[PDB]
Amino acid sequence: MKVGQDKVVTIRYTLQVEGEVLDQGELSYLHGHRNLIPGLEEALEGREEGEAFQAHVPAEKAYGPHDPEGVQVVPLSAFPPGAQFYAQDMEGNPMPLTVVAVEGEEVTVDFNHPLAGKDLDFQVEVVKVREATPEELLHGHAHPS
Template identity: 45%
Template sequence: MQISPRTVASFHYTLTDDQGQVVDSSSGREPLTYLHGSGQIVPGLEKAMEGRQPGDQFKVDVTPEEGYGVHHAELVQQVPRAAFQGVDDVQPGMQFQGRGPQGAFNVVVTKVEDDTVHVDGNHPLAGQALHFAIEVTDVREASDEELSHGHVHGPGGHDH
């Protein structure tokens, strides 16, 4: 069976950056399982998965536009430390969720200076090309329940 809309695909992956450094990998873990066509993986990788079948091994380079997006300078901001009420020790690397006119958003603290906290609302991989090495391990038809819920159930997916 080939990967197409209405299928559940499982795959092992290694993600590297432009310098060849491993950013993430499924090595030593269960394969990643997703509902194809539901936007659960970055668009460029999902396009490359189309038509693949178990046993296929391939590499794909994904542009920032087809990955985690381009880096938006306006999402890098300085906010007063007072905005972090209830957090005594704000440190670089900490992640927070905020609310704005468009709803909830996540930020990462990049620097702390006196009463100013520098935050970045971009995805950590925004603006970066993604280099995937993929091995497809399984493809099956999605159940009606998975299709109606928009995600995989059972092993490698979500149990209700």
């Protein structure tokens, strides 16, 4: 069958950003329940099982724009590039920061999601398409194999 609302879709994909691959594998998701990033799900819409395709999905339809407000300078004294800090939220739900630069007392931190502001490039194979079982529809997600 073909990808649509309430189908469980199994894809084999590669993900590349700025020309470099960041991730790959096989996943199964329930289509039409906001389980995938919007742009990818849109690109999958209507595809027949067995289809292969590329899809460019811009930041606006993936992990959203990079909030320049999420970049801040914190004191070196406040800490206990590429540095990932899982520092405690102020009220709940921690937010991983990543340091981009540090000069003296000053440290530059970033609250944004890693892929924020990034256009994503996907190579995709639609491996299987079937209808969701009633349990999957209840939980609102795929129960793979």
